[PDB]
Ligand binder design. Structure first.
Ligand SMILES: [Fe+2]
Ligand SMILES: [Fe+2]
Lengths: 171, 171, 171, 171, 171, 171
């Protein structure tokens, strides 16, 4: 080769292609969670709106990485998006615990993207990862921890009054 | 024949006359439910406002069917409106369960009105039933199911805090 | 039961339950009259709008009596609403004469409700009947008398120009 | 072939070409009626404005059918537009009776277009006919019936005061 | 089973689950096309904005079908989303031809969904398909046909002036 | 015749009846041209809007002549409107050339209407023709000549870029 490419390794190009697939898969998991809470035998509307907003954010993360790949001079290759591991999510506390578990994995993958970028002397890539992806994750993790603590203290999962009142007052 | 009548069978004319009576009877059942929740030993004001709104909607359904009957060239015949089957409604969950049971019967009657219109080659009547009466019913049924699920989970009927808080936050 | 009941007889409770049924029956009669004048071989739109307004007023009278019954500490019991005595109303002068005949009967029933209330020493009930129901009746009767006199003088019922011009200028 | 054609029969294509010609012919009949009522020995201005509005509506019906034909992938073929059957329309009641007679024929032709569409498994065409053409006809027929009834009752055609007052108050 | 389910077959439930997957796959194909036209050796910005808008529309179609599935009383099951068949799209006329080919397949699948709903006596489902999905498809097909015709006439693909001027003036 | 007729010959009455038919026929030719350019294998939207505007203007010319016939005291007689001579119009330059050829014929017919009015001593008719119909024609002819010259110079008909750019910039 490209006429705009300068100081961009092949390994970085492969790692960006893996992160794009990971973000699309997370967006699909959140979409499944959202429409579980819309059923007539679950019926909690603010849980549903919350997870639909999360699903709309992961997709913007993916599109931003695709724009970076085109700016630096590499080529995009897409893969299959696999289906989520759960079909029924069982409760409102259980979904929050699974969401925490997923955001920690995404954070762990970004940290290795950053160590690869520093092993190759690519300061533009290091600055991109630090500015756009690293503070957002620790904020999301802190919020999900707060939610899980409050739901455990109110008395869920073996109490429906707890999840009804949490649906009303926090979300 | 009448000078405006064209492609309108006698059987359709009798079935429309039966549906008008069914809508008037449903309006009278909702009016009974409403003023049960206004008594001084029940005293729940948002249950009462909710059922009064439902009562005002059924009467508009009936008047729309009468206008159709006059547009196509048939004649209206009215019958006696019978009294409701219950006098005391016992609880707030119990009334929602009876309301669900009533809306399902009205839906079942509309489906046979539609099969009769199809067996007779009357596309104007089929379009009227599909446009004005069929999506409204499935929406009403989905809402009443949501309400019953939430009230059962909060712990009603053997808990007064549940119905007090449901009166305040949902209705 | 009741904790709010004070100075309220059983006979008064039965008479209020009869007046509620009478008001619902009058509302049903006016609804029949209204949709007779909407047919394509009668076709007089302001007669129809006038009788539809009367039908919407009788129903509010009934709901106000139900609220009184709950305020004083009695219990509501509903009956069957019978069908009207006429199906075809024959003319525009004929319907006005039947309407006058019906309002006089309702007035006669209120006068006996008032004499019962005074025979029992119930001043709250006497004040309710005098304030909300007695001047409205004499005003409605005076108006229907005016209408009948004007229609007879213009030359109805054996003149269509008369009822066309009355539909247009007065109503 | 056409690159956009899918699930569209030749018979449907011929029937749409016949309906276009029928709508153009109806527009020409209404234009003749309009300018009859503008003569100095007839002189009724609101009859004339009413029939000119009807003439402007039939032409839009025809243009909408031509747009459908181009959307589905068929080809338009035009024919001769014949002249109306009457030159002098004789009265104001007589023109309304002829107008009713014409709208009933157009309705009868649309009903066979719909039965052809269902015999061929074309749901897009059935939905087009039901949504845009079938309720409009029954409304037009009900209105013309009202007009004819009122004019007969006022005493037309052997009374000029009747048609003068009807020209002034209804139209 | 469910407490809201009435007149809903198992076969319809399986067919809706297949249509959801088809809509998600179409959205992913459009997203691939969009970011091909953003490369530095292709560089056509209005082609890219056009295909990104199409990608955002398919996802709303899918979410609407999921809401229907929950309203009627069935259960959602998700599958893997496969990757697109092409990686490099070769030209601007070539992408429009592939887009036409895709929309025709989606239309063919909806027509069989409708024939299944008719063979089972489900008028609510038939009305849903006719109102929300069938006119939209024929409009999209007519537009893509227009685009392909204009690009072929201007002289593409063996002329860069053609696609530059089409990028500027139409899109 | 008539009580308002004065200085109006029978020959003038027949010539006005012929001009009305000529204007209706021109309106129908323009309507055919318009919907040829809407097909999916022609696809030029501003040619279509231009010819639809011309079609709406010819009909107003005809209605104005009918009003004059009623003002002077003659009687209107209508004939059959024949179908256009072409079905496929082949190109944009070709349609512009046919339009020029049609407007010249209409002008030639108006000039003989004027010579007839002068041979009969009818100054009101001469003033009508001069004020409302004669400058309009020479302006329309000058415009169509401009269009044909520009299209020939750009390189049509054997160049699609020419007609695409003329569609965009002039119309
Ligand atoms: Fe609270
Ligand atoms: Fe240009």
């Amino acid at each position: 080769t490209s006429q705009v490419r300068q100081n961009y390794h092949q390994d970085s190009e492969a790692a960006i292609n893996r992160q794009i697939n990971l973000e699309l898969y997370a967006s699909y998991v959140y979409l499944s969670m959202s429409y579980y809470f819309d059923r007539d035998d679950v019926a909690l509307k603010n849980f549903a709106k919350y997870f639909l907003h999360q699903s709309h954010e992961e997709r913007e993360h993916a599109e931003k990485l695709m724009k970076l790949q085109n700016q630096r001079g590499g080529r995009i290759f897409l893969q299959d998006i696999k289906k989520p591991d759960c079909d029924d999510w069982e409760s409102g506390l259980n979904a929050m615990e699974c969401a925490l578990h997923l955001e920690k994995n995404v954070n762990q993958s970004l940290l290795e993207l950053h160590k690869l970028a520093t092993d190759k002397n690519d300061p533009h890539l290091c600055d991109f990862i630090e500015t756009h992806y690293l503070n957002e994750q620790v904020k999301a993790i802190k919020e999900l921890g707060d939610h899980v603590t409050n739901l455990r203290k109110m008395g869920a999962p073996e109490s429906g009054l707890a999840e009804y009142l949490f649906d009303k007052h926090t979300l």
